[PDB]
Enzyme design. Structure first.
Site, PDB file in Angstrom:
ATOM      1  CD  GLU A 169     -45.888  27.804 -10.180  1.00 27.04           C
ATOM      2  OE1 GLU A 169     -45.136  27.493  -9.231  1.00 27.04           O
ATOM      3  OE2 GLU A 169     -46.593  26.977 -10.797  1.00 27.04           O
TER       4      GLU A 169
ATOM      5  CG  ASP B  15     -38.896  22.081 -24.725  1.00 27.90           C
ATOM      6  OD1 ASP B  15     -38.070  22.888 -25.199  1.00 27.90           O
ATOM      7  OD2 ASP B  15     -38.551  21.109 -24.028  1.00 27.90           O
TER       8      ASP B  15
ATOM      9  CG  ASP C 167     -35.524  19.848 -25.882  1.00 26.02           C
ATOM     10  OD1 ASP C 167     -35.433  21.097 -25.858  1.00 26.02           O
ATOM     11  OD2 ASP C 167     -36.120  19.185 -25.003  1.00 26.02           O
TER      12      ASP C 167
ATOM     13  CB  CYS D 192     -24.451  18.688 -33.280  1.00 23.80           C
ATOM     14  SG  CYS D 192     -23.835  20.154 -34.127  1.00 23.80           S
TER      15      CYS D 192
ATOM     16  CB  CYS E  64     -23.432  23.253 -36.073  1.00 19.96           C
ATOM     17  SG  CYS E  64     -23.836  22.004 -37.309  1.00 19.96           S
TER      18      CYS E  64
ATOM     19  CG  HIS F 246     -44.742  21.244 -17.924  1.00 23.01           C
ATOM     20  ND1 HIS F 246     -43.622  21.961 -18.287  1.00 23.01           N
ATOM     21  CD2 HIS F 246     -44.341  19.957 -17.794  1.00 23.01           C
ATOM     22  CE1 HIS F 246     -42.589  21.141 -18.376  1.00 23.01           C
ATOM     23  NE2 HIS F 246     -42.998  19.920 -18.079  1.00 23.01           N
TER      24      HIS F 246
HETATM   25  N1  DTP Z   1     -36.395  21.250 -12.447  1.00 25.17           N
HETATM   26  C1  DTP Z   1     -37.440  21.576 -13.220  1.00 25.17           C
HETATM   27  N2  DTP Z   1     -38.596  21.935 -12.622  1.00 25.17           N
HETATM   28  C2  DTP Z   1     -39.642  22.261 -13.386  1.00 25.17           C
HETATM   29  N3  DTP Z   1     -39.728  22.290 -14.718  1.00 25.17           N
HETATM   30  C3  DTP Z   1     -38.569  21.934 -15.280  1.00 25.17           C
HETATM   31  C4  DTP Z   1     -37.404  21.569 -14.633  1.00 25.17           C
HETATM   32  N4  DTP Z   1     -36.404  21.263 -15.540  1.00 25.17           N
HETATM   33  C5  DTP Z   1     -36.982  21.445 -16.705  1.00 25.17           C
HETATM   34  N5  DTP Z   1     -38.296  21.814 -16.625  1.00 25.17           N
HETATM   35  C6  DTP Z   1     -39.272  22.166 -17.646  1.00 25.17           C
HETATM   36  C7  DTP Z   1     -39.458  23.675 -17.708  1.00 25.17           C
HETATM   37  C8  DTP Z   1     -38.400  24.028 -18.739  1.00 25.17           C
HETATM   38  O1  DTP Z   1     -38.548  25.349 -19.247  1.00 25.17           O
HETATM   39  C9  DTP Z   1     -38.679  22.935 -19.756  1.00 25.17           C
HETATM   40  C10 DTP Z   1     -37.686  22.738 -20.862  1.00 25.17           C
HETATM   41  O2  DTP Z   1     -36.464  22.148 -20.389  1.00 25.17           O
HETATM   42  P1  DTP Z   1     -35.232  22.101 -21.384  1.00 25.17           P
HETATM   43  O3  DTP Z   1     -35.732  21.798 -22.811  1.00 25.17           O
HETATM   44  O4  DTP Z   1     -34.124  21.224 -20.950  1.00 25.17           O
HETATM   45  O5  DTP Z   1     -34.721  23.606 -21.420  1.00 25.17           O
HETATM   46  P2  DTP Z   1     -35.022  24.866 -22.344  1.00 25.17           P
HETATM   47  O6  DTP Z   1     -36.067  24.577 -23.418  1.00 25.17           O
HETATM   48  O7  DTP Z   1     -35.364  26.003 -21.477  1.00 25.17           O
HETATM   49  O8  DTP Z   1     -33.666  25.181 -23.114  1.00 25.17           O
HETATM   50  P3  DTP Z   1     -32.743  24.254 -24.023  1.00 25.17           P
HETATM   51  O9  DTP Z   1     -33.532  23.058 -24.488  1.00 25.17           O
HETATM   52  O10 DTP Z   1     -32.384  25.100 -25.258  1.00 25.17           O
HETATM   53  O11 DTP Z   1     -31.535  23.853 -23.229  1.00 25.17           O
HETATM   54  O12 DTP Z   1     -38.801  21.754 -18.934  1.00 25.17           O
HETATM   55 MN    MN Z   2     -37.131  19.764 -23.154  1.00 25.73          MN
HETATM   56 MN    MN Z   3     -35.909  22.792 -24.659  1.00 29.99          MN
HETATM   57 ZN    ZN Z   4     -25.008  20.256 -36.150  1.00 31.26          ZN
END
Ligand code: DTP
Ligand code: MN
Ligand code: MN
Ligand code: ZN
Length: 384
Positions: free
Chosen positions: A40, A105, A107, A118, A124, A311
């Site tokens: 997928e 993942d 964050d 931050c 940063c 996921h």
């Molecule tokens: N609407 C959605 N549908 C399906 N999966 C999702 C959705 N929103 C987020 N996810 C899942 C898949 C994403 O790659 C994952 C991680 O989200 P998120 O941590 O906010 O972004 P990211 O890791 O791509 O970048 P960043 O954290 O640096 O902003 O969560």
């Molecule tokens: Mn996340």
């Molecule tokens: Mn993320």
């Molecule tokens: Zn910082």
């Protein structure tokens, strides 16, 4: 302003996206029948519109569809029992996720309670060291404790990092076993209503000892200088909230008589190693000191990303629409030097491409593809 993105995305998907390396990755040597065809993909288009259960026959088919739709971002999902794009013709109950990389993942936003510089999605150089420690701690455990050989770390493009664990037998792991791996790797527990998030046992497991020893390499420069976690009473009170009351006054007096965080940390360690946890016995140790360091520096995972076989996760070399940054592989051998702010945006590499062989080798993306290729070469070796 995401109205300039469509023009830049069209060039990116036509001349810069590393299609052949990308397909080498997700085709996994072509050994298993339909492995790529049953993957997928989920495209996000303009206006937060997205499509589930896209799938492609081969590399040419993927290129043509990406260049037709020019998605704002691309997510990778599981390998299914049937072609995702035929899932509506499959008898109910038979369409099933079967395999997927084990992913993580992380964050930076999850660290806001222990970050002073931050908040929210900001990062940063003074707090990026949290990711440096997270990569080293998690990667060591995946490599040494679990024996996973094929690990791709990626900058997510805004506020953290991803890891894709791609070993053959890892890809078949059940959600229940994935969840078990997360628990093994987790120490920081509790929401905003939990002040003290780390509690260690008397005998510390080698995973915990090894993770503490990694943090110890970074803690002075990160926590005591950059974050200055004991700068003043506003800051050091947050740390006193993590130790028994019966030593607050003694530590207050030492903090007020010390000049800087470095000296005040040294006093906390001395006092903490004298605290009697069990008046039953005469055993003393650095449990408190460790619990503080772990609460401030130990990896905090977005756990739900790792537990579910189905996921979606944003793809390597996808654009992050909120920053324009390319989600780039991280050179594990240079993790301490990784600068998220040198990571090229799609605008920056489209400018390089035509500033005075018209592919990514003319741009700042090239060294990041090289890291990807090293990861792919190791996968190739593992299959012969
Ligand atoms: N609407 C959605 N549908 C399906 N999966 C999702 C959705 N929103 C987020 N996810 C899942 C898949 C994403 O790659 C994952 C991680 O989200 P998120 O941590 O906010 O972004 P990211 O890791 O791509 O970048 P960043 O954290 O640096 O902003 O969560
Ligand atoms: Mn996340
Ligand atoms: Mn993320
Ligand atoms: Zn910082």
């Amino acid at each position: 302003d995401p109205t300039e993105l469509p023009e830049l995305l069209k060039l990116y998907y036509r001349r810069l996206f590393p299609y052949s390396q990308y397909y080498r990755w997700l085709n996994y040597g072509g050994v298993i029948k339909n492995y790529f065809q049953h993957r997928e993909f989920s495209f996000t288009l303009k206006d937060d519109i997205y499509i589930r259960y896209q799938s492609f026959n081969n590399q040419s088919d993927l290129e043509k569809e990406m260049q037709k739709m020019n998605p704002y971002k691309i997510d990778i999902g599981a390998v299914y029992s049937h072609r995702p794009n035929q899932h509506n013709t499959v008898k109910l109950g038979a369409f099933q996720a079967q395999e997927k990389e084990l992913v993580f993942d992380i964050d930076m936003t999850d660290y806001d309670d222990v970050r002073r510089c931050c908040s929210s999605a900001d990062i940063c150089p003074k707090c990026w060291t949290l990711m440096t420690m997270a990569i080293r701690i998690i990667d060591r455990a995946l490599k040494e404790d679990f024996g996973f050989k094929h690990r791709l770390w990626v900058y997510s493009g805004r506020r953290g990092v991803h890891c894709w664990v791609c070993d053959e037998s890892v890809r078949k792991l059940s959600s229940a076993v994935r969840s078990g791996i997360v628990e093994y790797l987790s120490l920081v527990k509790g929401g905003q209503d939990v002040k003290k998030k780390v509690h260690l046992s008397e005998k510390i497991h080698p995973f915990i000892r090894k993770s503490i020893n990694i943090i110890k390499k970074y803690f002075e420069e990160y926590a005591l200088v950059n974050q200055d976690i004991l700068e003043n009473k506003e800051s050091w009170d947050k740390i006193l909230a993590l130790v028994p009351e019966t030593i607050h006054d003694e530590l207050q007096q030492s903090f007020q008589k010390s000049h800087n965080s470095l000296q005040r940390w040294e006093h906390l360690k001395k006092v903490a190693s004298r605290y009697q946890n069990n008046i039953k016995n005469d055993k003393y140790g650095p449990w408190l000191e460790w619990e503080i360091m772990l609460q401030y520096c130990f990896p905090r995972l977005d756990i739900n990303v790792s537990k579910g076989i189905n996921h979606l996760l944003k793809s390597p070399f996808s654009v992050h629409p909120k920053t324009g940054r390319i989600s780039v592989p991280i050179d594990l051998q240079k993790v301490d030097q990784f600068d998220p702010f040198t990571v090229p945006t799609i605008s920056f590499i489209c400018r390089e491409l035509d500033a005075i062989t018209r592919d990514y080798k003319k741009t700042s993306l090239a060294p990041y593809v090289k890291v990807f290729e090293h990861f792919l070469e190791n996968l190739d070796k593992s299959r012969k």
